């Protein structure tokens, strides 16, 4: 939901 | 700048460090922003709509070598608690910095109780909604130091207690004697 940083998405290296 | 020996630099690792998060899910989370055409990474937490938050983020183990005192530089954003609807009755605008020395890397075995608090980390400037929506966040910089260190290595850890925080940079160094 509420984002701490704009236009940020959860990320995990492939 | 000169004569600094860098032991840890989160921003330079390009999202590859994968730090331990306790709890996993709804606590600290690795995030990517690519709006600059270059990706930047951060550890973010924003669980401001529910109380009793105790979210931990622990760096990987750091070999101390000959370092006797370390200097810690953090860069981070904090959103105004007024940005949120009103059940934000547990929202905070600070987070806590901890550390622990140990002679061995405990790996996935993370124990809060072994960590010592360095300080409360507070922002000089919070990011209000109008700036958030315009993609103009306020990046804070805070520095702390810890010593003397005596063991083979150490951890840093970050405790969130209900703030909306994005941690963009963690740089640890010591000075050559």
Show the tokens assigned to B141.
């910089």
Residues of A in contact with B31 (CB under 8 A): 4-5, 8-11
Residue in B64, B74, B34 with CA at minimum distance from that of residue B149:
B64
Please give the Cα distance from B102 to B122 (Å, whole number): 28
Elucidated via: X-ray
Please give the Cα distance from B43 to A10 (Å, whole number): 9
Residues of B in contact with A8 (CB under 8 A): 31-33, 42, 44, 166
Angle at B28 between CA B102 and CA B47, to 5 degrees: 135
Q: Which residues sit opposite B29 in a β-bridge?
A: B44
Report which secondary-structure segment, H or E, holds B131: helix B129-133
The residue extents of the domains of chain B are 1-177
- Residues contacting B32, CB < 8 A, separation 6+: A8, A9, A10, A11, B15, B39, B40, B41
Q: Which residue in the set B30, B132, B166 is minimally distant from A11, CB to CB?
A: B30
Please give the Cα distance from B42 to B14 (Å, whole number): 10
Please give the Cα distance from B143 to B72 (Å, whole number): 5
Please say whether the structural domain B1-177 has been given the CATH code 1.10.20.10: no
Residues of A in contact with B15 (CB under 8 A): 11, 13
């Amino acid at each position: 939901x509420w984002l701490a940083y704009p236009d940020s998405v959860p990320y995990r290296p492939k | 700048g000169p004569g600094e020996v860098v032991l840890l630099d989160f921003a330079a690792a390009g999202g590859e460090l994968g730090w331990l998060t306790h709890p996993y899910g709804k606590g600290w989370d690795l995030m990517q922003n690519i709006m600059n055409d270059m990706p930047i990474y951060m550890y973010s937490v924003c669980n401001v709509m529910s109380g009793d938050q105790d979210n931990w983020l622990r760096t990987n183990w750091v070999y101390r070598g000959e370092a006797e005192r370390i200097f810690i530089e953090l860069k981070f954003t904090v959103r105004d608690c007024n940005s949120f609807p009103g059940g934000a009755s547990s929202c905070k605008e600070t987070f806590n910095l901890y550390y622990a020395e140990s002679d061995l890397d405990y790996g996935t075995n993370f124990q809060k109780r072994l960590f010592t608090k360095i300080d409360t980390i507070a922002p000089d400037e919070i990011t209000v909604s109008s700036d958030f929506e315009a993609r103009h966040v306020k990046l804070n910089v805070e520095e702390r130091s810890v010593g003397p260190l005596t063991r083979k290595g150490f951890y840093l850890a970050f405790q969130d207690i209900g703030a909306c925080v994005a941690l963009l940079s963690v740089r640890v160094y010591y000075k050559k004697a």
